[PDB]
Amino acid sequence: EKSNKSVAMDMLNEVKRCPDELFTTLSAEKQSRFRIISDDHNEVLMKRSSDRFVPLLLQYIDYGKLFDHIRFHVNMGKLRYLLKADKTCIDGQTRVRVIEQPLNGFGRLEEAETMRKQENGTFGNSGIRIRDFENMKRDDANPANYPYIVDTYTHYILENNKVEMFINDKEDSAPLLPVIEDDRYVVKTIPSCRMSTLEIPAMAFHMFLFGSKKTEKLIVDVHNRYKRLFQAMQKEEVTAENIASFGIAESDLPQKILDLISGNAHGKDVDAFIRLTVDDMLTDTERRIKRFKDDSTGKLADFLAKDIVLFQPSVNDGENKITGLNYRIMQSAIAVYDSGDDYEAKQQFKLMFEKARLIGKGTTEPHPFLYKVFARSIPANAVEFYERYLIERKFYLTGLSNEIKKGNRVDVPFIRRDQNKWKTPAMKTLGRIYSEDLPVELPRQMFDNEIKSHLKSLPQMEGIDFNNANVTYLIAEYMKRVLDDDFQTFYQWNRNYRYMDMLKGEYDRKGSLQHCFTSVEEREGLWKERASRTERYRKQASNKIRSNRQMRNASSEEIETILDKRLSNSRNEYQKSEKVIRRYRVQDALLFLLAKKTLTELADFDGERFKLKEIMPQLHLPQVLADAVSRLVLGKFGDLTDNFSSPHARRKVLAGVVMTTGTDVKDAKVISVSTGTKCINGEYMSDRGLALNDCHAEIISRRSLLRFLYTQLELYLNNKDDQKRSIFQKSERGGFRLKENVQFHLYISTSPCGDARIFSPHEPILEEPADRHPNRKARGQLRTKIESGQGTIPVRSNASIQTWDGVLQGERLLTMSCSDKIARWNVVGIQGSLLSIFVEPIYFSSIILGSLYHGDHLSRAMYQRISNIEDLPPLYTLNKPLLSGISNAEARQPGKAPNFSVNWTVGDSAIEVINATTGKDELGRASRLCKHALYCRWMRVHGKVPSHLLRSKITKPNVYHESKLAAKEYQAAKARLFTAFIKAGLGAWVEKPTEQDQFSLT
RNA sequence: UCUAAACCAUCCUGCGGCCUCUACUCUGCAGUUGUGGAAGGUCCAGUUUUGAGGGGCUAUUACAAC
RNA sequence: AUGCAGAGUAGAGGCCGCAGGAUGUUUAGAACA
């Protein structure tokens, strides 16, 4: 419920808040001063969400009953009627068609509101039901539910910075509500006259000085002068001789009246306009063609729908052109169009434009060039359609330009020669339009002369030049000189503007332009000096762009244009903002004055003292198995090195493989043990397969496990009694398979280099969450050890393939990281290609780290990154082994990393010591683990296996690479793996030069 | 066996400048035709702290018709 | 309502530039089996 008192209090609570335009310019400290704590201990931003000056003033006049005759334009809801429940649209789909009309009228907000909603819930004297606000079925298709009126509280219509009003002849007139006819037409009333919202401060000021009745008489008198003028025009009784008699200043007459009496009445030149429009549009078309080739279908469809309708010829008062619903459908249809080169879908898309009568035979108003878009072929999607549309537009406009250049007359659909725009205006015709068809446009400065005459009589105003004094100025002088008041303190606070930053030309040490907060006095002075200061600004700013590495310095236009737009936009933003804030000041003065007047005359209140200046705002237990394998590997190593005393007992990384045959830890056997941290030097690659390429422990321990597997196949093939002791058995699928209970577990002293280690090279502080950046592209990426360099490096940075001659000259040899190699084992198996011709894929059940264990990283590295692996050949799978750290992590081994690498397989009398730099032992002899040795074992086993018992029966020559290729399924699993990594965007595997595996056994 | 210096080019943590996606909130705009530039919005340069003028360009407010 | 544009806030990335740590080689010295 509003009242005189409530409006007064709404005004005072308006002026304590910061205007939004001001708030933007203030320092954080001063912005903080509007953030208030309420009574109920709640923080409130005391900032204006909109300029409510004008509605507040209208409420003041209405509730005050201050105008006897003038009533403001109110809206009281919308009428909705159902035109058709089943309307076939241009896409041939049926939709409801609802039409809305606003219920606009004139009266005091309270009186109009009392009329709007009857007790029976109907609108005014219409009979038509007002639908409850909670009911929101806008798509409702039931004719019985229509017509209805949307429930909306009476508000003033305040659009386009205008206030529209109706002048009643008699006082105490009732609200003027629109009549509804045929449950369909809302019969509305042209306003008497329309006032700029920028005129409302002067009206308020006039009201405050003279009284609302004197204010009202003036508006009505001005209105009646315009009406008398427009009546005389219709009688052709307006001349240069008598124009002054109408009582309206030249600057408040339309130019056409001034042209007409001066004998200079003219239309615009349509041909010039056509020539200009065609050229402008051709240029724009080429701009759009270029931008698109250089570079949202929604954005495309917006352009296309507007343009298609622009080029649609109008006939019959425009009744033929595309209507609202069909427009929305056309635009949306385009936005989502994407056939798939489906013929029917293409036909359907073309048909839409046929039904809109834009293309096709028998069309009378076709689009001039759209049909060319569909000549030869229908475009497949919105993007193809936009391109073809623009090309065809270019050809059409070029044709027109060429005809214009020949001096010929051309016509475009959207320029219409019959519009008055192009004809000479007539007095009598124009008289009628001004009198009958439109509201009177009230002039600016209508209250100025009266305001100034009053103020001239006040002795406090004696020393002001009223010949250079606008009403904004005079309100402020009134507050200061008659009332000893001033604006709110926050209009003196320093403000920030980009434009003023540029003009001040102040940079911080990094080189960025500083945000200054200036006073109004400072800005006055910067503005005076803007020419010089703009020169300086541009010089520096151009260098900043020119210093940037991108090369656009040869072109002259590029930079100057960028800066032109920068300075224009900034300058315009600053000027408008400053002008508007100056309006907020005097608006606030007026609200304060009016509110204070209301409250003074209400109750025991002595408010003369108050001033605006004062206003302010599970088979095993994980850890048991982990610690078992850890102690057993470490222990077997301690045995082989004479209690870690032996010459080669020094190690940095240690690894090993443990076999389990059952849950009994008295059934755990150490299969192999190894140490090493280096890879071969490039000069020492062996084309006979006699060197070890990678001596990182875990890699060596797998190779030792291969030896053990060979030994077991031989044990089985030796004799029947031995078959019982061998871990292998025949498979019904052909070849050999492990016994049901048999499992292998890998143990490494430390995380495998690469994805499991690079990000987390330190021991986790326990209970720590995963890495804070798990989505970086670095994560999961394949990595290589790089020859003669530290760290493990993405494969993407070395895309080329490795060549033998290349490495030899000094290209650095790349070896896949241990993380990548073990993930590979978790797909293709640990046995490798050659054993896969005899045995079924074998996987590690567990990977156990003695230090540097990060499950988040280890799991990603070991399998998670390639969970998108598909089409694995039979018996292959993405193995997910038990991952675990140990109970008591190992200490950093002290000293420098030995250049040697130690191996041992179960059954061996001694360890073997290899120089990782050379791939060979101290005396330069080949390893029992080298390619050649393993090929030798493989050849002997091959000779002993009856050909019916082979998993792969492919026969190839006895070259290592060929023999590996015999393992067709394994190679296919390897291809699945590589594709998994690539498709996950983790880079392509790097292999050795193809010469590496091209040797025979002598 | 221990220590010092240098290189390789990635990774982590923090701080700047620039560009994108995801989620949430708010505002603006969204058929054609006719009339109308006194008004509202926009731009130009010896323009204003004074919603005041000047010169170029513009149908947004409203009305009826479909 | 739905779609298109603009602004704000938080998160996650990409590029450019700084500071401090982490991670296979090269050049020396001391000392030892």
Ligand SMILES: O=P(O)(O)O[C@H]1[C@H](OP(=O)(O)O)[C@@H](OP(=O)(O)O)[C@H](OP(=O)(O)O)[C@@H](OP(=O)(O)O)[C@H]1OP(=O)(O)O
């Ligand atoms: O990881 P490593 O133990 O060092 O050995 C492997 C193994 O080669 P060898 O068993 O012949 O030593 C791979 O062969 P498979 O057993 O999986 O069949 C081979 O891959 P290819 O099959 O493609 O030859 C790969 O070499 P690369 O991947 O570099 O081509 C090579 O690793 P290294 O090259 O690092 O020794």
Ligand SMILES: [Zn+2]
């Ligand atoms: Zn490694």
